[PDB]
Structure 1
Amino acid sequence: KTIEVTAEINCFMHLLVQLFLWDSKELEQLVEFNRKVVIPNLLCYYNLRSLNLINAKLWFYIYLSHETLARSSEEINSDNQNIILRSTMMKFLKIASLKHDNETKAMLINLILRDFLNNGEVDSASDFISKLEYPHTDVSSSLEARYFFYLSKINAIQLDYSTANEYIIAAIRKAPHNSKSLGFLQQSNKLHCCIQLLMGDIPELSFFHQSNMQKSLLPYYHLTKAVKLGDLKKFTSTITKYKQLLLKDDTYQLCVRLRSNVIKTGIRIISLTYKKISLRDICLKLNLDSEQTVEYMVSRAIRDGVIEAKINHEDGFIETTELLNIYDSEDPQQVFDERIKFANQLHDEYLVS
């Protein structure tokens, strides 16, 4: 019955193109009708040549419209169709034998991760990461960038920019398609710059100027000068005017995390090079915000890995260091094992070639 079911799905996938962004039928009967045409053993026993014939790429942007101001309209707690969808979604992975499953495994997790990004808890999503990791060979180049996009965003909420760094690099290099290079790339580039917001670098606009429109260039340019110069007044006015753009991208959390980075980045911008820095010179610098926070401000920045200094309360100064040394014995050997580790990523090219 594999050919008979596949022949019927061939006519079903043609209708799903209309159901996606084109013809939505009814906002009530359709979501109940699309459920009864899937469950009755379309995925069957995994006999032969079974993949890409399910919904998969089509339903990502469909069900999100029915949940927001369509079927629910904040009249209920959650869509009963989505509750059953979460039951069918997690049942698809439970019955999977982990044999030929590559692309179909990573697409369903994209729903449970995206749901936690808007309404939900992302702490439980860390447990799914251990199950989510598989060497998927069937994922198309369009979905390889999206698979790396969600993995980098979850680590941002977890306060780790080091792990999310490797995922976001391969995300912008993939998805050559035009629609993925406009809406998906501009949203991904803002998340790539968000990693630099937590790192403290925030490079200038060179490649990102012509790659995206002026919509994403305005907030990043104002946040660049605000974090670098260490001005909380200009940083506060940026959040208020650009709040409309910050809410849709779930970037509104920068009012705390990135606000703490305004002080940390401004430390390296101003010159601490001299050893004994008097308390009055610190209060004058960084406008008046550095006057209220002096000893505590430097204390946490040292342990976090920004700078290395020493505070003396007796004479009222702070001994600072710029981290400058000369390679002699153990100094150059620290990067020796790192440069070898940097080449380990290139040692896999022997099996690829």
Structure 2
Amino acid sequence: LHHSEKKYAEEDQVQELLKVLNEISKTTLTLDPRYIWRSLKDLSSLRNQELLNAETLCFTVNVLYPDSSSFKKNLLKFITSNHKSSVPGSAELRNSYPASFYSVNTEKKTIEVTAEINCFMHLLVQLFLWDSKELEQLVEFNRKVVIPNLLCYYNLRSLNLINAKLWFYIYLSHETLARSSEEINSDNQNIILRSTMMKFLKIASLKHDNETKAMLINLILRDFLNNGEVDSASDFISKLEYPHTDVSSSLEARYFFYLSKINAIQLDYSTANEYIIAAIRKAPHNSKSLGFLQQSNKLHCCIQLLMGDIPELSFFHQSNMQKSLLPYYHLTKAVKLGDLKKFTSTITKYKQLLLKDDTYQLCVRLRSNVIKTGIRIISLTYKKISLRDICLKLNLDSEQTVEYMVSRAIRDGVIEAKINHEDGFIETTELLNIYDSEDPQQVFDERIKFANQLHDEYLVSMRYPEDKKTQQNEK
């Protein structure tokens, strides 16, 4: 029973413990140790579920615990206490480790390796919480213990790398609890949580660890936007302190998505669209990335519709994600066909859907775009057209009504016309002749500049693995 599963599971945890130990004790190469540890977590979450769940307590007693065994027992009671073949003398050794040394070195006293035992202990904890899906007390318990400990060290870059990945989970459980239960307590500690992240982020500037900085930035940007204040988030990003050294495919895709959401609702859709295109691009394409991609698509359509430029029908059609993009497809059709009444119905029919996903606020400004897109088609199709004919086409009352709408629309430059209320028709002003302007030299210069950017990025990247590789042993 007891002895069987826990011992088996323990064999893998010992092997895992040394993978962290050996890289950091010989000093990190930054990017490479990091990646390994990510591969390590894929394995651990599975093992934690499997073969009881006291596999960790059995382990905690095996390694040098300073007080870590107390916190473990409390996690354990909730999912039904186990504690047989996790007592001393049947799960204890202080030998078989170079991670805790032999017994004699513990006794005599030696240098701390209890830091990395602790960080790694806190891994198993963060893991435990997510895997079981524990809610309520456990969220408070874990957070309050772990973070004081990370500051009782000497704030080493070796230990910063490992514990940075702990921050993601601390953050997940707080939001989950807040979404489930509406309570004054959850509101109250959210102010503590922003405060803490900024505190760490200062510390990690000093100590210059780029991963700790990239992760802490993304969690707190997400938090401000969930509570809906734009201004705090915008002020934060324009200090330009995001790193690019230790950053990842997911991590940079995430940043850009925040950048999109801020700039669109600030009424600049050119600057918003720049980011969202970047976000889809960095991200992998998997069934595990499905969530991220799914939400990226939803935001993309609307940013584009707000410009008055329309997404193609093949987008939605060949999507495997098409039965959630169905209110979004109707947004495309309704704007394009210019019909006031379809729009009205769409955002009323699909109001719960739009409001769930938070995209309903950008759909309000898409009301304006119905008119704007319809007047645009008309500028393309007709060069000279009476004011009267226009009022029948979009169903407007006065000559006066169309004239207010058109002028504003060409303040933005969307339609590309000029009104002649000296003769009572609207004249289209697009007359091309852009290869007969001076602008084309300038259009090529930016492209040339992007090709120079890849030329640098190639040369500098190439040599970076190669220093290490020529130093590496070979026959």
Q: TM-score, normalised by structure 2?
A: 0.64
User: Could you give the per-residue CA deviations for residues 314-337 of structure 1, whole angstroms, max 9, x where no partner exists?
Assistant: 432222223423633535445344
User: Could you give the per-residue CA deviations for residues 26-80 of structure 1, whole angstroms, max 9, x where no partner exists?
Assistant: 6443232122322324145665453566665565476566556669833327533
User: Deviation of residue 169 (structure 1)?
Assistant: 2.5
Deviating more after overlay: 59-68 vs 130-139? 59-68
Matches of 1:193 and 1:169, distance apart in 2 = 11
User: Could you give the per-residue CA deviations for residues 125-159 of structure 1, whole angstroms, max 9, x where no partner exists?
Assistant: 21111235434221122222112221222112222
Structure 1 contact 43–54 (Cα < 8 Å) conserved: no
Structure 2 contact 214–243 (Cα < 8 Å) conserved: no
Q: Does 1:51 align with 2:159?
A: yes
Helix, strand or coil: the match of 1:173?
helix
Structure 2 contact 264–303 (Cα < 8 Å) conserved: yes
Structure 2 contact 305–366 (Cα < 8 Å) conserved: yes
Q: 1:167 aligns with which of 253, 275, 283?
A: 275
Helix, strand or coil: the match of 1:155?
helix
Deviating more after overlay: 296-305 vs 29-38? 29-38
Structure 2 contact 387–425 (Cα < 8 Å) conserved: yes
Structure 1 contact 273–321 (Cα < 8 Å) conserved: no
Structure 2 contact 213–243 (Cα < 8 Å) conserved: no
Q: 2:240 aligns with which of 129, 132, 138?
A: 132
CA RMSD, 1 decimal: 3.5
Cα pair distance change 1:211/1:59, threshold 3 Å: farther
Q: Which residue of 2 aligns with 1:141?
A: 249
Deviating more after overlay: 111-120 vs 25-34? 25-34
Choose between structure 1 and 2 for higher RCO, CA contacts under 8 A separated by at least 6 residues: 1
Runs of 4+ with >6 A deviation:
289-292
Helix, strand or coil: the match of 2:324?
helix
User: Deviation of residue 200 (structure 1)?
Assistant: 1.8
Q: 1:311 aligns with which of 405, 412, 419?
A: 419
Cα pair distance change 1:132/1:250, threshold 3 Å: farther
Q: Which residue of 1 aligns with 2:428?
A: 320
Helix, strand or coil: the match of 2:169?
coil
Cα pair distance change 1:344/1:281, threshold 3 Å: farther
Deviating more after overlay: 178-187 vs 245-254? 178-187
User: Deviation of residue 102 (structure 1)?
Assistant: 1.6
Matches of 1:188 and 1:326, distance apart in 2 = 35
Deviating more after overlay: 242-251 vs 273-282? 273-282
Cα pair distance change 1:350/1:66, threshold 3 Å: closer
Helix, strand or coil: the match of 2:195?
helix
Matches of 1:290 and 1:135, distance apart in 2 = 56
Bigger Cα Rg: 2
Structure 2 contact 338–374 (Cα < 8 Å) conserved: yes
Structure 1 contact 275–320 (Cα < 8 Å) conserved: yes
Structure 2 contact 298–325 (Cα < 8 Å) conserved: no
Cα pair distance change 1:184/1:51, threshold 3 Å: farther
Structure 1 contact 229–269 (Cα < 8 Å) conserved: no
Deviating more after overlay: 324-333 vs 161-170? 324-333
Q: Which residue of 1 aligns with 2:305?
A: 197
Matches of 2:289 and 2:133, distance apart in 1 = 30
Matches of 1:289 and 1:172, distance apart in 2 = 44
Q: Which residue of 2 aligns with 1:103?
A: 211
Matches of 1:61 and 1:40, distance apart in 2 = 16
User: Deviation of residue 307 (structure 1)?
Assistant: 2.6
Matches of 1:118 and 1:98, distance apart in 2 = 29
Greater helix fraction, Structure 1 or Structure 2: 2
User: Deviation of residue 302 (structure 1)?
Assistant: 0.7
Aligned residues: 353
Structure 1 contact 145–170 (Cα < 8 Å) conserved: yes
Structure 1 contact 6–53 (Cα < 8 Å) conserved: no
Structure 2 contact 257–275 (Cα < 8 Å) conserved: yes
* % identical equivalent positions: 100
Helix, strand or coil: the match of 1:216?
coil
Matches of 1:290 and 1:105, distance apart in 2 = 58
Deviating more after overlay: 156-165 vs 51-60? 51-60
Matches of 1:275 and 1:84, distance apart in 2 = 61
User: Deviation of residue 230 (structure 1)?
Assistant: 0.7
Show structure 2 runs of 5+ residues with no match.
1-108, 462-475
Deviating more after overlay: 333-342 vs 157-166? 333-342
User: Could you give the per-residue CA deviations for residues 182-225 of structure 1, whole angstroms, max 9, x where no partner exists?
Assistant: 11111112222222122222221335543442233312221111
User: Could you give the per-residue CA deviations for residues 159-182 of structure 1, whole angstroms, max 9, x where no partner exists?
Assistant: 222223332223212332635431
Matches of 1:351 and 1:232, distance apart in 2 = 55
Show structure 1 runs of 5+ residues with no match.
none
Cα pair distance change 1:207/1:347, threshold 3 Å: farther
Helix, strand or coil: the match of 2:292?
helix
User: Deviation of residue 226 (structure 1)?
Assistant: 0.6
Matches of 2:416 and 2:435, distance apart in 1 = 19
